Design a protein around this motif. Sequence first.
Motif, PDB file in Angstrom:
ATOM      1  N   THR A   5       1.304  -0.579  -0.413  1.00 20.82           N
ATOM      2  CA  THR A   5       0.291   0.452   0.438  1.00 20.82           C
ATOM      3  C   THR A   5       0.840   1.300   0.081  1.00 20.82           C
ATOM      4  O   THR A   5       0.575   2.198   1.209  1.00 20.82           O
ATOM      5  N   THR A   6       1.193   2.012  -1.423  1.00 21.01           N
ATOM      6  CA  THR A   6       1.984   2.420  -1.477  1.00 21.01           C
ATOM      7  C   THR A   6       1.085   3.971  -1.669  1.00 21.01           C
ATOM      8  O   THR A   6       0.560   4.171  -1.352  1.00 21.01           O
ATOM      9  N   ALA A   7       1.951   5.544  -2.215  1.00 19.75           N
ATOM     10  CA  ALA A   7       1.222   6.364  -1.733  1.00 19.75           C
ATOM     11  C   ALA A   7       0.633   6.494  -2.744  1.00 19.75           C
ATOM     12  O   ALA A   7       1.032   6.386  -3.874  1.00 19.75           O
ATOM     13  N   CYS A   8      -0.409   6.593  -2.443  1.00 19.29           N
ATOM     14  CA  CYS A   8      -1.900   6.159  -3.438  1.00 19.29           C
ATOM     15  C   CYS A   8      -2.830   7.285  -4.029  1.00 19.29           C
ATOM     16  O   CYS A   8      -3.136   8.352  -3.160  1.00 19.29           O
ATOM     17  N   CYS A   9      -3.826   7.360  -4.196  1.00 21.60           N
ATOM     18  CA  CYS A   9      -5.495   8.368  -4.168  1.00 21.60           C
ATOM     19  C   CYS A   9      -6.356   7.682  -4.916  1.00 21.60           C
ATOM     20  O   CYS A   9      -6.206   5.958  -5.299  1.00 21.60           O
ATOM     21  N   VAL A  27     -11.958   9.561   1.040  1.00 16.37           N
ATOM     22  CA  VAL A  27     -11.773   8.692   2.290  1.00 16.37           C
ATOM     23  C   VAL A  27     -11.654   7.453   2.677  1.00 16.37           C
ATOM     24  O   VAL A  27     -12.693   7.148   1.352  1.00 16.37           O
ATOM     25  N   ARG A  28     -11.415   6.840   3.352  1.00 17.47           N
ATOM     26  CA  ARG A  28     -11.548   4.879   3.384  1.00 17.47           C
ATOM     27  C   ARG A  28     -10.615   5.334   4.627  1.00 17.47           C
ATOM     28  O   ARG A  28     -11.135   5.363   5.672  1.00 17.47           O
ATOM     29  N   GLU A  29     -10.308   3.971   4.955  1.00 17.22           N
ATOM     30  CA  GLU A  29      -8.780   3.575   6.246  1.00 17.22           C
ATOM     31  C   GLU A  29      -8.359   4.510   6.093  1.00 17.22           C
ATOM     32  O   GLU A  29      -8.411   5.914   5.899  1.00 17.22           O
ATOM     33  N   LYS A  30      -7.291   4.368   6.640  1.00 18.91           N
ATOM     34  CA  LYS A  30      -5.992   5.552   6.527  1.00 18.91           C
ATOM     35  C   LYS A  30      -5.666   6.112   5.442  1.00 18.91           C
ATOM     36  O   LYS A  30      -5.753   5.118   4.825  1.00 18.91           O
ATOM     37  N   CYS A  31      -4.676   7.117   5.785  1.00 20.47           N
ATOM     38  CA  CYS A  31      -4.355   7.904   4.647  1.00 20.47           C
ATOM     39  C   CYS A  31      -3.013   7.347   4.250  1.00 20.47           C
ATOM     40  O   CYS A  31      -2.587   6.828   5.157  1.00 20.47           O
ATOM     41  N   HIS A  32      -2.456   7.683   2.607  1.00 17.43           N
ATOM     42  CA  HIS A  32      -1.444   7.278   2.280  1.00 17.43           C
ATOM     43  C   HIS A  32      -0.185   7.415   2.729  1.00 17.43           C
ATOM     44  O   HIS A  32      -0.030   7.946   3.661  1.00 17.43           O
ATOM     45  N   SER A  33       0.911   6.706   1.980  1.00 16.70           N
ATOM     46  CA  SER A  33       2.049   7.197   2.705  1.00 16.70           C
ATOM     47  C   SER A  33       2.996   7.964   1.938  1.00 16.70           C
ATOM     48  O   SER A  33       4.418   8.206   2.321  1.00 16.70           O
ATOM     49  N   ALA A  34       2.289   9.449   1.204  1.00 14.55           N
ATOM     50  CA  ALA A  34       2.415  10.395   1.030  1.00 14.55           C
ATOM     51  C   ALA A  34       1.332  11.597   1.604  1.00 14.55           C
ATOM     52  O   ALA A  34       1.180  12.337   0.880  1.00 14.55           O
ATOM     53  N   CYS A  35       1.208  11.797   2.873  1.00 21.20           N
ATOM     54  CA  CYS A  35       0.135  12.816   3.413  1.00 21.20           C
ATOM     55  C   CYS A  35       1.614  13.973   4.010  1.00 21.20           C
ATOM     56  O   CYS A  35       1.899  13.135   5.103  1.00 21.20           O
ATOM     57  N   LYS A  36       1.196  15.051   4.004  1.00 22.57           N
ATOM     58  CA  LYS A  36       1.301  16.179   5.052  1.00 22.57           C
ATOM     59  C   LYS A  36       0.180  16.509   5.874  1.00 22.57           C
ATOM     60  O   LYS A  36       0.402  17.211   6.609  1.00 22.57           O
ATOM     61  N   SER A  37      -0.689  16.891   4.745  1.00 17.77           N
ATOM     62  CA  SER A  37      -2.072  17.106   5.474  1.00 17.77           C
ATOM     63  C   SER A  37      -3.071  15.528   6.150  1.00 17.77           C
ATOM     64  O   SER A  37      -3.057  15.289   4.554  1.00 17.77           O
ATOM     65  N   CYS A  38      -2.886  15.116   6.864  1.00 13.99           N
ATOM     66  CA  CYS A  38      -3.813  13.753   6.935  1.00 13.99           C
ATOM     67  C   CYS A  38      -5.073  13.793   7.805  1.00 13.99           C
ATOM     68  O   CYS A  38      -4.459  14.753   9.237  1.00 13.99           O
ATOM     69  N   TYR A  51      -5.416  15.084   2.215  1.00 17.55           N
ATOM     70  CA  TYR A  51      -5.135  15.997   1.521  1.00 17.55           C
ATOM     71  C   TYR A  51      -4.168  16.712   1.465  1.00 17.55           C
ATOM     72  O   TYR A  51      -3.881  18.341   0.802  1.00 17.55           O
ATOM     73  N   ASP A  52      -3.568  15.904   0.808  1.00 13.29           N
ATOM     74  CA  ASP A  52      -1.549  16.691   0.526  1.00 13.29           C
ATOM     75  C   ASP A  52      -1.820  17.428  -0.329  1.00 13.29           C
ATOM     76  O   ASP A  52      -3.494  16.701  -1.714  1.00 13.29           O
ATOM     77  N   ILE A  53      -0.638  18.126  -0.644  1.00 12.24           N
ATOM     78  CA  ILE A  53      -0.735  19.322  -2.158  1.00 12.24           C
ATOM     79  C   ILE A  53       1.192  18.538  -2.391  1.00 12.24           C
ATOM     80  O   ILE A  53       1.438  19.108  -2.128  1.00 12.24           O
ATOM     81  N   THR A  54       0.666  18.053  -3.664  1.00 13.38           N
ATOM     82  CA  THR A  54       1.401  18.126  -4.791  1.00 13.38           C
ATOM     83  C   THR A  54       1.148  18.461  -5.824  1.00 13.38           C
ATOM     84  O   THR A  54       0.126  18.737  -6.138  1.00 13.38           O
ATOM     85  N   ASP A  55       1.696  18.578  -6.819  1.00  9.36           N
ATOM     86  CA  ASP A  55       1.752  19.002  -8.692  1.00  9.36           C
ATOM     87  C   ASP A  55       1.373  18.011  -9.112  1.00  9.36           C
ATOM     88  O   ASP A  55       0.330  18.615 -10.268  1.00  9.36           O
TER      89      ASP A  55
END
Length: 62
Positions: A5-9, A27-38, A51-55
């Motif tokens: 379960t890598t950084a997903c969306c 919106v699911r179980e826990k947030c992924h492996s690249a979240c700054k806002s969770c 609710y991560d911010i990425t390009d």
Amino acid sequence: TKSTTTACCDFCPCTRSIPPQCQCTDVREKCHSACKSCLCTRSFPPQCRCYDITDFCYPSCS
């Protein structure tokens, strides 16, 4: 042994600004492996959200 379960969306909307900022509205179980806002809802069941911010957008989750 293959993957995990890598950084997903799931839903990956973005702003139409310059530069554009993309996020997750998943919106699911826990947030992924690249979240700054969770953050989660206090509801029943309490579901957790990224609710991560990425390009960019990440591949589909499970």
